[PDB]
Amino acid sequence: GSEEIRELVRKIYETVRKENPNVKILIFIIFTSDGTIKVIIVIIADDPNDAKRIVKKIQERFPKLTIKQSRNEEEAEKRIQKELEERNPNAEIQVVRSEDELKEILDKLDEKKGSWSLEHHHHHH
Structure with missing residues (x-):
């Protein structure tokens, strides 16, 4: 259930900030046609040499979760x-x-279980 994913992300966000508070995280949630969940964790820092250390922390603490490192802001959300x-x-x-x-x-x-949508993509800064 989604609450277990909502617990997990906090355990990551405290672990990553404990070694560096500057670095950003992206969490990818997958829903398969068979009803299976995948959870992918991506680290975005101002230097990818720091991101690699943070990724290694999550790789040792969560060996069953697949993870990535990224060098550019917002790009990984579409690239990955x-x-x-x-x-x-x-x-x-x-x-x-x-x-x-x-x-x-x-x-x-x-x-997605329903058949409805509301409003429009307005764009802003």
């Missing part, structure tokens, strides 16, 4: 999406950067 689409052809990929977005995916699973 297409790698994930190529290796999960019968799946949906969602990206999370705060635990409220992990709560929103639980509401979006109900919108």
Whole structure:
């Protein structure tokens, strides 16, 4: 259930900030046609030589979770999406950067069980 994913991300966000508070994390949540979940963790730092240390921390602490390092801001959200689409052809990929977005995916699973949508993509700065 999505609450277990919502617990897990905090254990990562405390572990990563304990060694460096500057660095950002992206969480990829996969929904397969067979109902299986995958959880991919991506580290974005201002220097990828630091990101590699943080990734190694999560690799030792969570050996059953697959993880990545990234050098550019916002790019990994689309770059890794297409790698994930190529290796999960019968799946949906969602990206999370705060635990409220992990709560929103639980509401979006109900919108996907439904047949409805509202408003438009307005664009802003």
